[PDB]
Amino acid sequence: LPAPDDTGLQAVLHTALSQGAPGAMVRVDDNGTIHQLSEGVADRATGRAITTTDRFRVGSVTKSFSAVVLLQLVDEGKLDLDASVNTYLPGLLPDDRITVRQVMSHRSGLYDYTNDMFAQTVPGFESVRNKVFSYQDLITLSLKHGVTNAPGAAYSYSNTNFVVAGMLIEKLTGHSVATEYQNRIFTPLNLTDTFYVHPDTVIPGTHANGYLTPDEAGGALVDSTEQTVSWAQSAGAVISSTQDLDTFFSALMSGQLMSAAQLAQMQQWTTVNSTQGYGLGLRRRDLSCGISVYGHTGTVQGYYTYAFASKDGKRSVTALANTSNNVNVLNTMARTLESAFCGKP
Numbered sequence: 192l193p194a195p196d197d198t199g200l201q202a203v204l205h206t207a208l209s210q211g212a213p214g215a216m217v218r219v220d221d222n223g224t225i226h227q228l229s230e231g232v233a234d235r236a237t238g239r240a241i242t243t244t245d246r247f248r249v250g251s252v253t254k255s256f257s258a259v260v261l262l263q264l265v266d267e268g269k270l271d272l273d274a275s276v277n278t279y280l281p282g283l284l285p286d287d288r289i290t291v292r293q294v295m296s297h298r299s300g301l302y303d304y305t306n307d308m309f310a311q312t313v314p315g316f317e318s319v320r321n322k323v324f325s326y327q328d329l330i331t332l333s334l335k336h337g338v339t340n341a342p343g344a345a346y347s348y349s350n351t352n353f354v355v356a357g358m359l360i361e362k363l364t365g366h367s368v369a370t371e372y373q374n375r376i377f378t379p380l381n382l383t384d385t386f387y388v389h390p391d392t393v394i395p396g397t398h399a400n401g402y403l404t405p406d407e408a409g410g411a412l413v414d415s416t417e418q419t420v421s422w423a424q425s426a427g428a429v430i431s432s433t434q435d436l437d438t439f440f441s442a443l444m445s446g447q448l449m450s451a452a453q454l455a456q457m458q459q460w461t462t463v464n465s466t467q468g469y470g471l472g473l474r475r476r477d478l479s480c481g482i483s484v485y486g487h488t489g490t491v492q493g494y495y496t497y498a499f500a501s502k503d504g505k506r507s508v509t510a511l512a513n514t515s516n517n518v519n520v521l522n523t524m525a526r527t528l529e530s531a532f533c534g535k536p
């Protein structure tokens with residue numbers, strides 16, 4: 192790989208601040224040599240500086256943790272990716288032909304209930320932030336809508352898919368998703384900054400606060416740090432750090448978290464766009480210099496995450512900006528992957 196470009200990373204973070212991120216940071220684990228940069232504030236009201244050890248909400252990076260648990264259950268003979276969801280969760284979906292593989296790759300057609308919840312950014316956040324939902328509650332909210340396409344037919348990202356994922360984990364194991372994440376992933380990899388505390392609203396330890404950008408241009412930011420994330424759960428509620436997401440995606444890609452067979456299934460790409468694929472709870476992004484990287488993005492209120500590793504896991508990068516609903520910042524933070532994997536122009 193090219194050398195990571197720290198001057199480029201510095202410029203990405205500085206641009207993100209200029210576009211409304213209170214703080215932005217990145218950590219690269221380059222085959223045992225660390226790069227770490229941060230700019231701005233973890234708490235914009237107290238002025239406390241952001242750092243690469245601050246914990247944060249990783250949003251949809253949680254889908255990869257859910258997918259790893261499910262794929263270990265496939266290795267254990269407890270789950271068949273081509274069986275119907277309703278085989279394990281009887282009566283759950285209106286179509287008994289929607290399969291586990293289709294849910295995990297967003298080809299199921301299930302409508303994403305979060306498009307109803309967040310049609311208005313700040314009112315929607317205020318509506319869900321202190322709610323506790325069951326898994327079934329969120330499925331029922333999706334099922335009020337029809338499906339959007341035939342099973343397996345079309346990629347359509349939907350949080351509903353990884354609500355089904357959490358239901359499958361709990362039904363087939365008899366344990367909570369927190370217990371399964373802890374025993375299968377967090378403890379074996381010693382991810383000491385990684386937690387699943389739903390429905391608790393506190394982020395353990397020193398953390399970046401999240402700042403939700405309102406829909407009104409120029410409007411005051413909303414502190415969105417403390418919320419249940421119950422509207423996402425196994426689709427979005429993990430808390431972690433840049434070092435722990437680097438360790439997780441490096442372990443995944445280097446073959447430490449499941450059989451080779453199941454990692455290959457995880458990397459069967461469905462097209463997302465001309466430079467992106469989606470596997471089983473896993474994203475592929477194709478970078479300008481002809482390198483592809485593997486991992487997941489996250490976007491929970493107040494936090495944008497990118498966590499991606501090279502194909503063999505030897506270089507991993509995690510970047511965080513503590514705002515959301517700010518597409519300038521989201522697009523800018525993606526450039527950390529270019530600087531960290533493609534290096535200087």
Ligand SMILES: C[C@@H](NC(=O)CCCC[C@H](NC(=O)C[NH3+])C(=O)[O-])C(=O)O
Pocket residue numbers: 249250251252253305309310311312313315350403423426427428489490491492493515516517
């Ligand atoms: C899938 C992933 N997150 C979401 O689905 C966030 C959707 C609302 C984000 C919100 N945007 C809006 O409210 C748009 N009106 C924002 O940018 O914070 C997860 O569950 O981890």
